[PDB]
Amino acid sequence: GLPVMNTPGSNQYLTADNFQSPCALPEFDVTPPIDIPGEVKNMMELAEIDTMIPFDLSATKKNTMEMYRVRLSDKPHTDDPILCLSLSPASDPRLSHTMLGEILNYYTHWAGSLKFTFLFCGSMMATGKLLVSYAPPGADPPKKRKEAMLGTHVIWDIGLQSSCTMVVPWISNTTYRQTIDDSFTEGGYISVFYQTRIVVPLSTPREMDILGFVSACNDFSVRLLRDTTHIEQKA
Amino acid sequence: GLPVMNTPGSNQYLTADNFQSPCALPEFDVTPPIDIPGEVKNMMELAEIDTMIPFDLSATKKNTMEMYRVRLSDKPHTDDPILCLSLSPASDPRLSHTMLGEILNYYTHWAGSLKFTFLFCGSMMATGKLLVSYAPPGADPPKKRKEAMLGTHVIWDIGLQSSCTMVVPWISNTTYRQTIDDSFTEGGYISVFYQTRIVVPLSTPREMDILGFVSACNDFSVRLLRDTTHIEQKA
Amino acid sequence: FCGSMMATGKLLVSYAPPGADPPKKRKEAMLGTHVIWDIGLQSSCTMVVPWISNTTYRQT
Amino acid sequence: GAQVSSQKVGAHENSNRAYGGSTINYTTINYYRDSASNAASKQDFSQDPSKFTEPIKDVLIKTAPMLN
Amino acid sequence: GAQVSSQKVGAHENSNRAYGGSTINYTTINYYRDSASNAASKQDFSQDPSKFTEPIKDVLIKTAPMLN
Amino acid sequence: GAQVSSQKVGAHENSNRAYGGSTINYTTINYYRDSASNAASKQDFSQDPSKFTEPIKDVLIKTAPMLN
Amino acid sequence: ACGYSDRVLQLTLGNSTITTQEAANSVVAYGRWPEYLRDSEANPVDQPTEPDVAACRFYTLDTVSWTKESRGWWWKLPDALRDMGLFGQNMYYHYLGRSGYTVHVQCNASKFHQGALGVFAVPEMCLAGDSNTTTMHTSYQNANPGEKGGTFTGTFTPDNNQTSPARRFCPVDYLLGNGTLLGNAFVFPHQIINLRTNNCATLVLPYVNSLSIDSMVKHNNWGIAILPLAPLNFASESSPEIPITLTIAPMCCEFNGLRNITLPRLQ
Amino acid sequence: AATSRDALPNTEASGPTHSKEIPALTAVETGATNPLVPSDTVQTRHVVQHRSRSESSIESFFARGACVTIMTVDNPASTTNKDKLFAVWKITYKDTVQLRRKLEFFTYSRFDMELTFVVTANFTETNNGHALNQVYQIMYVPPGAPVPEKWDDYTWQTSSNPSIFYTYGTAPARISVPYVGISNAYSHFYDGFSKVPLKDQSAALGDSLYGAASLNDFGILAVRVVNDHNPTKVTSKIRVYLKPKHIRVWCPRPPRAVAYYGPGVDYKDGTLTPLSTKDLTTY
Amino acid sequence: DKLFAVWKITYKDTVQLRRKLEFFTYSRFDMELTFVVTANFTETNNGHALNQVYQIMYVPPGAPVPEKWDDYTWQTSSNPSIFYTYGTAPARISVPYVGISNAYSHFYDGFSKVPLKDQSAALGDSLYGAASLNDFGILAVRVVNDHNPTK
Amino acid sequence: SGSMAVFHQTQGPSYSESKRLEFVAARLGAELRNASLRMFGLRVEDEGNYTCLFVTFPQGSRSVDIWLRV
Amino acid sequence: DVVVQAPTQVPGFLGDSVTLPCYLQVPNMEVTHVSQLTWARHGESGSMAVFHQTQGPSYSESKRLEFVAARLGAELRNASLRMFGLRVEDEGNYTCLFVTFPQGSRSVDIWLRV
Ligand SMILES: *[C@@H]1O[C@H](CO[C@@H]2O[C@@H](C)[C@@H](O)[C@@H](O)[C@@H]2O)[C@@H](O[C@@H]2O[C@H](CO)[C@@H](O[C@@H]3O[C@H](CO)[C@@H](O)[C@H](O[C@@H]4O[C@H](CO)[C@@H](O)[C@H](O)[C@@H]4O)[C@@H]3O)[C@H](O)[C@H]2NC(C)=O)[C@H](O)[C@H]1NC(C)=O
Ligand SMILES: *[C@@H]1O[C@H](CO[C@@H]2O[C@@H](C)[C@@H](O)[C@@H](O)[C@@H]2O)[C@@H](O[C@@H]2O[C@H](CO)[C@@H](O[C@@H]3O[C@H](CO)[C@@H](O)[C@H](O[C@@H]4O[C@H](CO)[C@@H](O)[C@H](O)[C@@H]4O)[C@@H]3O)[C@H](O)[C@H]2NC(C)=O)[C@H](O)[C@H]1NC(C)=O
Ligand SMILES: *[C@@H]1O[C@H](CO)[C@@H](O[C@@H]2O[C@H](CO)[C@@H](O[C@@H]3O[C@H](CO)[C@@H](O)[C@H](O)[C@@H]3O)[C@H](O)[C@H]2NC(C)=O)[C@H](O)[C@H]1NC(C)=O
């Protein structure tokens, strides 16, 4: 009956293949699903939830609480960066672990605008203005307020509304960027400077710390799944 | 279920075969195509674009600029060919590399009318009449204006309109000709002679050069694809 | 162009509004408002100097 | 009892229909009586990230001041 | 969801239909959900070689003089 | 795009239909886009042997005398 | 009607104006003419800046002398301009820059000279280096000659210095520098300036690239390559010399993501 | 409507002439090529042209599946002092001259890579031994993923790495891949660098090779011998054949004239001479 | 050197099919080529061999015919080829009328080059009945695997 | 997993700390082999065991482990 | 299975007329069927003089060269070639081809030292 012909690619198993296969337990009455609070329909949903960036990764402060507290002081106004960061929501050790940056390793191409949210964690009295800035790639990274200022910045203010968010608009030469430290698909440069200085009244803690959070925006998306370098199975 | 029967020719891979095959990256969101200036839908389109014939292939002049400049002089009118050429837009070393002749090697049968375009590249003063001619195969190649004249010729004129084009009408015993130097499927013979002589006034370069171009016409077509002899992979 | 019917060539007539080093090299004059004219059949050209000025009239 | 659906072709040349117009479909047929044997239909949905991003005992207007 | 199309038979004897009249068709069925897995439909088009042969800031009439 | 045709059964018992009445058909489906790949449809014709047997610059009536 | 004969034109992009008189009716790359980025195929999300007149105008680069031993010249457009007024300053100030062009290769002689200059506009013109040891090792500083441009050579000469090399391109002419026959090169958008007739060639090149808008400081697009097809001759005179001079004009350009100024090691 | 399998515009008839119409005369400066039909320079009859370009179409030119690379791998005895061989090839057509010249006629391309594998195998050593039908793993390790260390390491667990387990002697394995490009067409020719050099940095810190774009565009293929060290050492070769299916091409660049050299357009000396000899006046 | 046979496509090798076709002067047919591949161990030696796979490359009239067994010619970027695994349903590839004319001429009366007086008796000669140098084509068939101890 | 200084056959060097470290041999398009590294100013904690990687083709990813005893 | 026989090096006079001997001694008892005996040079697909089993000789320069043995329908073997008037540049390394059936395409490389 019916003359058929086995085609190049027969008897071939393909891990990510999708073909119907005989059922081991025929008839097994499956248990009805309840309505568990908190479903998730797509990974990029998780990508839109802020996760604190471990900004400091100094041999001493790494792998320990001190790693997320970016300390600011009441030092006389300077023009040097109080944090840097290579926009590589996958590559840069600073982002490589945050939910966003943790999901980004299970992929080969990320895209869309990101949103860094900074929380001033210090004495209700302390005030000041911090300039959070981004400058697309291909130019000397910014090391002075004078140079960073020229790029895309949001001159934030430490007040009642305790937090800010500088959206990093998706400005890139390709439709997606390599989720590996590739030179052609470079990310850009993020960097917060003091626009004034954190001024405090007498009898106040002179060294308050800021915590940074990061997340994707309803634009972001990833593609071509892979195995995260993050966890190894020794032997 | 369904009684089938594997038919002679099963489990057989056929390079140029066309069968649907499981997809390695299921769901991968392909990147939308933009509208890049300059698309091409069919090879024979390229075949209709002129490419300069390297008419001279003398050990000295070959593989170097001098190879495309067919020099003409103010010599007293003679009846000898100032260039020849075996119509074999594939075989004859003179055509074997031109776009047309380069695409013709990736095939086993060519067909349709060709169009040789000659450009007089010399002093605005110099004038003259050159007789570009073609004579279908099976007869002594033409070596004298007196003999070539009898065939299909376009007695061209060096004037304001700096270039001419002698269409070589597809006159052949078979529907397509072997894209190899085959005797049965012979091409014919092309050959430009001086119908007068290139006459020049005093204080003029007495040795101007002509450049020839060749291309197919909306009639030409090729069939039965093969591997071009032109480029070898040593070891 | 008042010369032999045979002679040819291309002359770049140029204008550059004030307040900058006068142009002394084709490389610098080129940047301003120019009409790269051609010595041919039509024997003459005309480079209009557009009224570009900070006041409604200029001191004569 | 064919299950014909539309593929999401990237308007590729001579794929059946694209920037010359046309659509692309694919036949499916559940063969086994036991559902847990059907091919993962990949026609999955997408909810709003709000039950995780924007979860509050009130409502949040973006142009408004956070901590009212 | 069959994709029946006409083959371009060279009116061969007893091939189904030729110089006795008749046409020849062939059934196709996209089987995989992912488009990049469909059989190269070979029903490709052909544009005019003009964007390469005849590309000018004007128009060219053949019977006319080239360099006007 | 099924190609159902009638077989030429020799009215065999219990073959589907014969000397009890009935017909016999068989489904065919061209599967490849290239015609020169279809199964030799065997539904070939038959011309009159005249262009070889009876070829004359006139007409030949059999009951008549050959060399008139 | 009148003398609106193909031979005369009057290009005016920006505040500059070319008006040639032997003009061989111009070429428009691939039918497609230069235009701005339709929202339908845009990529970067910020507001794209557009110098318009500030940049769009004609910039004359520097003239090249043309003798008998002249073996050809080659420019790398995106780069070739890098200085030329604001299209120079905007060039560097942004991470992304999509720009179209209008190259007008000017060069005229007398009715008594002779020669043909094939002006070929090659998209993605990757010229080949000169180190038989390592491939592509060609240095940037050297790879982007700008306003001055490079020049094709007679026969290949391998760079032997290896304590430290000369890292330059050694572009042979019969192989159009990119190891592929010149006689077949007439496939790219082009015009042959044939001294007898026309005294200029005008090709309008619309931005072509695998991306919507891409870089400039980095990636190059079009590249002009002028080669003498018919060598120059004049009177029984030792050697004659006419000066070829191109003038390019960046058209419908736009740039995204402003930053601090880029300052490449061009020295 | 004008498909590839139509039929070239039929040749129209044409008698004598003496018109001021000048079809024959061109002027190549315009760059435009005279679309003169045979019907112009001679009196033509009315031929009903059947021939069609149905085979030269961009799709059919690349209808055959070319061999992009060969991959040697071998399963030695447990007692082998040397580590077990598992080849790893970086996806990139640019390894063999053939498919590389076809693609190279065009500046840009958008195609769906349809990779097939014809795996073979023989017993290395003189020794007369046996081997139960081996099974191979062809793991696609996406650009940036961890490339396999030992033959049998965790990297091969392949929880998210598209892999194929080919049993020796059977219909040759096949996996279709859609346009996996970061851009909107794979650029067969990239003019420019992947890192611009900047004055406020060392000549090194910011350098790079001409023509190189992405570190790992297409990806890498890890192929092991899945079975364990068997007394009879068996070497195998996995010839991968890539056939561009749903394809498109842009800007018709002139074909490679002199022998290829490396990933870059560069060319070695000697090989520099391509043409053949022929007398400027001999048929 | 390792043996890879190369046969020039032409029915005229065996008497059978050659007499059937020969009853008619001209013919237009679609050649449907099938391959029944077999194999034994040459030498007395008692050895083993993992199931071989063969390549049957169609090298179109004029294309380069394979030099060594393993050379570039076999890369087959554009040469219709089949990889038959030993012991399996015998391979089959249909071919459409690949004739230059409008029927394969089972009998060609006349020469492929006419002799011309203004030439040497040699320069322009030729064999009677011969038409095209390579009508149908040539078949290159190798053993795809590597040199194995048991021949 | 966070890799320090890395030198790609094309993208060139990739210092995770541009200053305190440098590839005393890796010179673009040449041929990667002697990858010995040299870092300036050591640091009580700079001390440890590293992983020297060589993504080579077709040899697999090679890796050796150095006790850096300060 | 035979082999391409040829005097490896063969010089090589100025303005003379040398014979590039290239024969093919086979394994008599064992037979093959030659198809075409044709030359070239080396770094040049363009083939010079070629002699097809049927179409006869095929001189790329009808004059300066000739097959001192190839005689139509006979049996291709001794394909040695002989070209008249040498030429400062005639000097070099050639490729003697033998598209034979069923033996594969045989090829030997001659230094022509003038
Ligand atoms: C760098 O690595 C070296 C070498 O060791 C190897 O790499 C290590 C990173 C690690 O992966 C190890 O498994 C591998 O072999 C380290 O030096 C070794 O360190 C181990 C563990 O600290 C030492 O183990 C001890 O060995 C000594 C003598 O050989 C014993 O006296 C000692 O006694 C026992 O220790 C075990 C647990 O280790 C206890 O259970 C017992 O109760 C008992 O106390 C250990 O067995 C080993 O000796 C070292 N090997 C060598 C060759 O020096 C080194 O520490 C790493 N560097 C740094 C900076 O950490
Ligand atoms: C024809 O071919 C012969 C034989 O050589 C073979 O064919 C060649 C075409 C070529 O493919 C070659 O690879 C093959 O073996 C040629 O004669 C040979 O030519 C080569 C290269 O010129 C010679 O190489 C030199 O050998 C001598 C001594 O044997 C060395 O002293 C010399 O020194 C070194 O050269 C290498 C590069 O060649 C350098 O890297 C070193 O720095 C150093 O200078 C070379 O090694 C070889 O000797 C020749 N062989 C023989 C047997 O003569 C011949 O040139 C070709 N003819 C023509 C006309 O070109
Ligand atoms: C890999 O390369 C490195 C550096 O490029 C080599 O290390 C160093 O090589 C230099 C040059 O030979 C050596 O310097 C020489 O020795 C004296 C004193 O040792 C030094 O003062 C001078 O500069 C002199 O040129 C240096 O000793 C050496 N250092 C070490 C630690 O080895 C290294 O040799 C290369 N590796 C291999 C395997 O070749």
Ligand SMILES: *[C@@H]1O[C@H](CO)[C@@H](O[C@@H]2O[C@H](CO)[C@@H](O[C@@H]3O[C@H](CO)[C@@H](O)[C@H](O)[C@@H]3O)[C@H](O)[C@H]2NC(C)=O)[C@H](O)[C@H]1NC(C)=O
């Ligand atoms: C292949 O054929 C060629 C020519 O057909 C042979 O070369 C030449 O053969 C002739 C005839 O035997 C030789 O000529 C004879 O020798 C003397 C002087 O050598 C000559 O003056 C006379 O004409 C005499 O007949 C000639 O020497 C020889 N030349 C060479 C270079 O060999 C050739 O022998 C044949 N090859 C083989 C392997 O048989």
